[PDB]
Design a protein around this ligand. Sequence first.
Ligand SMILES: [C]C1=N[C]=C([C][N+]2=C([C@@]([C])(=O)C([O])=O)SC([C][C]OP([O])(=O)OP([O])([O])=O)=C2[C])C([N])=N1
Ligand SMILES: [C]C1=N[C]=C([C][N+]2=C([C@@]([C])(=O)C([O])=O)SC([C][C]OP([O])(=O)OP([O])([O])=O)=C2[C])C([N])=N1
Ligand code: MG
Ligand code: MG
Lengths: 562, 562
Amino acid sequence: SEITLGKYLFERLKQVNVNTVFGLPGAFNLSLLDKIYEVEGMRWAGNANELNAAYAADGYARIKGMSCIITTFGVGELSALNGIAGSYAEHVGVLHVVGVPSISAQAKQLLLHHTLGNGDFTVFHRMSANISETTAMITDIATAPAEIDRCIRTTYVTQRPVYLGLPANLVDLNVPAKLLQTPIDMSLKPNDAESEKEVIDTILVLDKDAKNPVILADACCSRHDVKAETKKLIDLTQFPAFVTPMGKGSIDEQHPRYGGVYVGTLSKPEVKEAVESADLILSVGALLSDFNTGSFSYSYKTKNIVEFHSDHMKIRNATFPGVQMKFVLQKLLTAIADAAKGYKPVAVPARTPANAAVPASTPLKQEWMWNQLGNFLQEGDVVIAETGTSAFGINQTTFPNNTYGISQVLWGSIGFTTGATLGAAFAAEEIDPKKRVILFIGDGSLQLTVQEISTMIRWGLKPYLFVLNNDGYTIEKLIHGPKAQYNEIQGWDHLSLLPTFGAKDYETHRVATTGEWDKLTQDKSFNDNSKIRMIEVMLPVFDAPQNLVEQAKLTAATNAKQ
Amino acid sequence: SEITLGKYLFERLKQVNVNTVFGLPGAFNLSLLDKIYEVEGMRWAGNANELNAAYAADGYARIKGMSCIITTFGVGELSALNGIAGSYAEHVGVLHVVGVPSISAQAKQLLLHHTLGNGDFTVFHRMSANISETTAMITDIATAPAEIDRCIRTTYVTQRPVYLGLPANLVDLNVPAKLLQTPIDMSLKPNDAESEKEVIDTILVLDKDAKNPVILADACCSRHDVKAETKKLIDLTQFPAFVTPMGKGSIDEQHPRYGGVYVGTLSKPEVKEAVESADLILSVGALLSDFNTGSFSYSYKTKNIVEFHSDHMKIRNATFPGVQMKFVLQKLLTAIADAAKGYKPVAVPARTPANAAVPASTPLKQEWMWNQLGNFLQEGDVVIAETGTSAFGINQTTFPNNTYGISQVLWGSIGFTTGATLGAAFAAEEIDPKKRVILFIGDGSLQLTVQEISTMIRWGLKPYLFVLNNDGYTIEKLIHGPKAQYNEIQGWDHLSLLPTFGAKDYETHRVATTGEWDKLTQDKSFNDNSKIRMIEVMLPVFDAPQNLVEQAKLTAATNAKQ
Ligand SMILES: [C]C1=N[C]=C([C][N+]2=C([C@@]([C])(=O)C([O])=O)SC([C][C]OP([O])(=O)OP([O])([O])=O)=C2[C])C([N])=N1
Ligand SMILES: [C]C1=N[C]=C([C][N+]2=C([C@@]([C])(=O)C([O])=O)SC([C][C]OP([O])(=O)OP([O])([O])=O)=C2[C])C([N])=N1
Ligand SMILES: [Mg+2]
Ligand SMILES: [Mg+2]
């Protein structure tokens, strides 16, 4: 008949397919964490710090659908803020629960640990409200179940962080268990009928008139869950389909109508021209950040641009506030084939040619590696690429179908990917034990969050950790200060990290040549996700993908401009 | 003639005795960082992450007087916030300079990396305003020197963090170099003459009357720079002098008038009675947090209390807004000996007896270790104790005179001390190469900030890193859940950390018996700060100082109270 508020939270999380919970303990949340162990199928990650935990919750949400991190008042929550900000910026549904002092301790304004010593128990909640879609600070047991529900719903449907503060005393108070028998409503509200019809009719007419329409899938294609619809749209229409860096993975790169990675002026000439020559652009989930776009360098030649977004539509100069793309895309599928029936298929640019055979002793170079990497990938892989050369280079890698890419192009917080790898590996394990998780992280970025490797080991997760050793911050050196000491890093013994963190079942590998790369990555046992691996990749100091060389100059100029 | 705004900043920092600058680079601050190398006597730490950099700037400021951390917009600054908030809570003057997008970039609202994608460039500044004494976001070159000077002054005189945003384009513009020839005013404003005279005269008359006065030194004694005056006051009066956990180190423990560590009901009975039986209490810099006070358990039996504070005075029920203790204490030196001339000295409580001789093979215990540690310490040592058993246990250690203690009793962010150790070691090196820096950090806390050892190594800093291996979060286990899996940690090979981060000149030791403890710590070579050292200390899982056992129960009850 009755259940603790704490246990109710974990029962709800289990109902919405969140099965791993991130964060660190502190006195203000200990009684709440107890409740995790009362719920079958729920686990506590036991993160090495709160920032890493927040990055992990982000990785988990991207793969699983949403996530939860629990921290402690002041010291835990403030540690996590950069992770939460990144989740807000990139539209990732992370529920951040904070164990806060009891109602009675607040009432009496006790000078407790983890406060600013001024009796203000609102300050951290206030700070988090800036990077949250909504917040709740629970003060009474009576409406607490509904507020938990609302927070979980909002996290999921808006795909942005939500803040939920739970006083220590309230987690052990009882609420009706019967509440758990009605599901949380996880569904979008239908669109305005008249506005949605206008948009659909208008698109269909633009489609009928188009001779070279193109589809461009960007971040929100993935973040707001329209990949299936976009795939159908591609198949029914036969229109060329291109993807952005931030949306890479949202469309199948083995589809015969897939045209490549569009990055404005930084695209392959053939890709740039194929996109920009379009007489109708179907833009799915645009997020036009500097790195996503070669510093705002799109040069569409047509006015006929349809922008599909999670919360609104735009057609040419006309805006349709509130009209959600999910339902527009679904309903379009009914009549889009008819609208496209006169289309005569325009050729797409061909895939970048495979690397030519070279001697086994050929030193590894970035351009070669990114082009070679597609050989190692397989359908189902989660492929994570850190801000730095890795994020820029993965744009050149051809993905198998059904690859989930993670690249934090907008927020661009180095170190993110160590934590994201952990969360992705949890979620991937829960989905399918044979799903591989593959990380490319710079030597510089690894340093910020290196301890989260510990948490991978403790749970026997088996990601592939490729560390690009180029002796410092190459991306920065290419922006400004190529020999500046601030761009250099202390030299670590990367392959000793796993055993240092107590790993027992693992492999470590170093590759420095083309021969070594091929030998390792083509190897049958290596391709099985049987244990955690670290691969140290030795690369030259100033070597970078060409797109990064160019973007670095553009970014330098933007910042230096008077 | 003219100097860049960026170089002006570093010239000012040099003038105010800030010679190490903390933080991490990002495109928005790279041109600024260049200017560090243009100023002789200035260096860039090259921190391994921003949170650790903020903890470091905090440790540096505690030893040196104030500090500066530079981060990048969004990703850098938010990472630092837990460090900044602890500095705000514990009154440590840290100048947080953030490299922000150029004026033209903000005006056109470019969708740049490290933004929330909504074109709001004020949001992170807003967030930091909550944990800063003042803020400045520089927009006009003409007033930028004055604004820098204002921020530096405020950081130092108020001993609280200040936020300074510097658009990337502005750092390279010129300002008049002759401004540098007039020093920043770093002095307190004189007190209101009449109010101060009233306070002084009243205290001198209370003094003349008291038969059992005592002096109690707390956190703000050291944080607000009145340690010399307080010591001199003890010497002139010969009144018994006690210290709090947060103030420990502020007064000299090898002084015939030193009475012990007062912690309300957690005190030695002799110490508790000596303080609470007083007929006059001279309280210097009180900060009555839960852990500092045994959960608010002071039981003074007099109302004759003089509270000295940085920004005001209190005498019994009478408050004197704005009367700063610095000048009150200094001027009391003139006539307080005469006022105290009738005082017949009351005996002080005896110091805890030395440990009894025990067999060399006796396994190490916490209580023995804290009571032995005083043998190893020397005058001038910086002694840093992490939240957990270390912070509570260090209360039991006798300090040599002139010991700088660091224990973050109020904010209590585990991991703080790895960074604080770096900051303190930089400062100590600048003050006196022979000054030792000694850390006691738990195995759990080390995990959150472990990478900052890298930065110690790269600069050839030589602290003593004592890591307390008790297989998890013992403090938490004693509060709630002694066998809870959230209180356990992944087991690391601690002694491999130094070589894993590239150390070449170092020692590692393990101690597990009293014999091993004594042989190592009494060793003449060990006692020289000739290289970085890590000492793994093997301790039992549930072993703790008695004061923690008691505090842990009081904390649990406070959180659980309905
Ligand atoms: C958290 C954080 N911090 C800092 C930063 C910066 N960064 C980056 C950028 C781009 O972002 C800018 O600048 O803005 S990048 C970097 C470096 C990295 O390195 P690595 O990892 O090594 O890579 P490569 O390139 O070499 O491969 C930096 C520092 C951020 N972001 N975040
Ligand atoms: C950042 C951060 N996080 C978390 C936390 C919590 N904690 C602590 C306290 C007291 O604070 C509470 O509870 O709140 S403590 C801890 C643990 C530690 O462990 P170690 O280091 O290992 O030590 P010993 O010696 O005791 O064992 C925790 C987790 C904070 N704070 N912060
Ligand atoms: Mg690198
Ligand atoms: Mg421990």
